[PDB]
Design a protein around this ligand. Structure first.
Ligand SMILES: Cc1cc2ncn([C@H]3O[C@H](COP(=O)(O)O)[C@@H](O)[C@H]3O)c2cc1C
Ligand SMILES: Cc1cc2ncn([C@H]3O[C@H](COP(=O)(O)O)[C@@H](O)[C@H]3O)c2cc1C
Lengths: 347, 347
């Protein structure tokens, strides 16, 4: 039951956070001098799945892949098959997230939640259908299909926790997916489409007008309820967006941290927090996406990314890049010396 | 001869940069989607010491330690001995830079260029004197002493290059050093002291006025020539600042990259670029320091850091934290697959 799932998400452990802060203040450095690295360590200490201390065991990046009917509206320059081809490359370790994950010592899990092609060997099969419906003329899927995918992905995610995974990263792969992502952001934040529609995978500037038009039509035609995150996902979202939201709900239920990626992921996080506000404390930003609507989405999530790389690739590449930062906060916490031990006293 | 040194700094290799850009454009991703990670890889390809390709061999962080006479003016809350104590801890691996360097697989070299205490076993000895002169009433040192230290540090730095080191990080340790750092930044940028004097190691807000006053006096009394970087360093700088500038000149001469740290390092980089503009292409920013004058210093260096961590510890801790990013750009370059190989064609 999805209701049980959402009900059982743990609140953060304030007691462990207090012990953590005290320990950090006593380290060999002026109090608060390591800034965000200190607040990150405290955040981690409060997550129940981490056993009262900032720590990182195995790391995994979950890449949700799916095609979208809205591609027919001419909102993407990349051929539709690129989704299936790149998904295949994910199993070969040659994509951007694969290379960055390897560099961070993380494993990449490629999940097909709705690719419009024959099944790809090596890819986790959780496909709902061959691509979702064209949001410009109707809903992407039924509410039942959205809830079912959320549940299955949430379970798969927390199941990995039993394999030693303590840190997740979310990612996606799907031609035309920056369109539903913009639709969702517009609805959740109440911002106009023009302010949130970006160039995605190098869409020519002369084709942007059409993209904005399609986004408005999707909203006018479906009339999604902004107060109902699942309604929004099933109407103007996509299977990949749903999957990403599911990883966030699964990690939160598991009491573990999840690193966001770029714009697509911010869209999924807005949905996840709308569905269950208790998910918020488990989300960790990675980078500040070069996508046009990134600033608005992040402001509504009250998040300030650590990395400013002007990145806009997607795939969970930003999440993988930030993993070393999470490990750095843990190393600081566990390995630094203490002031008292050196007889150093500071006001 | 310092003149020879500055004369022999190599210009970047445009031919290798062109080959690099072509290769990056052909990788499995929409052109330019990895943003700053792509420009970083190209920057590295142009550095002659890297052999025409983005690569990272051994990594080292050089921490310059020294005391300052200006401490007597009440501009620092930390006792003067903390410099010597922390320098000792650097050899034990318990400080913040030590923990972060280990995490990045880098070695920390602790160099005493002017600590006001007995020599510390395990620390590289290059001390000019026991602390520099109080800049509030005169110069920190003679021009001869500044040039000599620049030379020695520059040589030590490029000598490490022969040991397999291809990536450097600069750092410092010295109670009261945010004062000369502010004086230098004010002089090089023409900004008022009030706009560049920060709280350093948690200086109380009620003591800031005095700090600004001391900085103005240092400048009025010494009258350093902003067009002469060495004049500025020897008059209102410190031994640690000089050492940091020396690492930058040494790495540039060696045709290798150097990662900056925080405010202290920005001050040393302004000097280094004033002395030899050819040093600029070898400098790589790490993070955006929480120090008040950071924004102004960075704007004058035309640099945009990758990490926003609100860090203000110093020691080269920011430089160590960014090393994984440099390695990430190299991994992307060498390990990603190619579009043509997957028959993917994009406008
Ligand atoms: C070769 C290639 C690799 C990619 N890896 C991620 N994306 C990104 O591009 C898509 C969204 O952009 P849009 O809405 O404009 O279609 C997603 O697949 C996203 O992951 C890629 C796109 C391409 C072409
Ligand atoms: C325990 C301790 C460890 C440090 N590590 C770096 N700094 C930083 O503080 C000093 C500059 O700040 P100010 O100008 O206010 O004195 C430098 O040593 C700098 O590296 C430290 C300072 C302290 C107290």
């Amino acid at each position: 039951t999805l209701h049980a799932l959402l009900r059982d998400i743990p609140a953060p452990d304030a007691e462990a956070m207090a012990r953590t802060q005290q320990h950090i203040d006593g380290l060999l450095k002026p109090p608060g001098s390591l800034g965000r690295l200190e607040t990150l360590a405290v955040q981690l200490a409060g997550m129940p799945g981490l056993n009262g201390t900032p720590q990182v065991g195995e790391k995994a990046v979950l890449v949700m892949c799916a095609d979208h009917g809205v591609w027919d509206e001419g909102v993407a320059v990349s051929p539709k098959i690129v989704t299936a081809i790149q998904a295949a490359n994910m199993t070969r370790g040659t994509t951007g997230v694969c290379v960055l994950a390897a560099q961070a010592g993380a494993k990449v899990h490629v999940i097909d939640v709705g690719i419009d092609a024959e099944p790809i060997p090596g890819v986790v099969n959780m496909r709902v259908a061959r691509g979702c419906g064209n949001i410009a003329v109707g809903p992407a899927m039924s509410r039942l299909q959205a809830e079912a995918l959320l549940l299955e992905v949430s379970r798969y995610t927390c199941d990995l926790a039993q394999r030693g995974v303590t840190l997740f990263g979310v990612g996606e792969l799907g031609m035309a997916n920056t369109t539903p992502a913009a639709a969702m952001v517009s609805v959740f934040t109440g911002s106009d489409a023009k302010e949130v529609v970006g160039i995605g995978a190098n869409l020519p500037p002369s084709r942007i007008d059409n993209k904005v038009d399609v986004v408005r039509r999707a909203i006018a035609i479906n009339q999604p309820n902004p107060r109902d995150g699942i309604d929004v996902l099933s109407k103007v979202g996509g299977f990949d967006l749903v999957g990403m939201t599911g990883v966030m709900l699964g990690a939160a239920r598991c009491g573990l941290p999840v690193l966001l990626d770029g714009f697509l992921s911010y869209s999924a996080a807005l949905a996840a927090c709308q569905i269950a506000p208790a998910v918020r404390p488990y989300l960790i930003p990675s980078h500040f996406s070069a996508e046009k609507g990134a600033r608005i989405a992040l402001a509504h999530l009250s998040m300030e990314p650590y990395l400013h790389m002007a990145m806009r690739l997607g795939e969970g590449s930003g999440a993988a890049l930030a993993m070393p930062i999470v490990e750095a906060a843990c190393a600081m916490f566990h390995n630094m010396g203490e002031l008292a031990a050196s007889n150093i006293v500071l006001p």
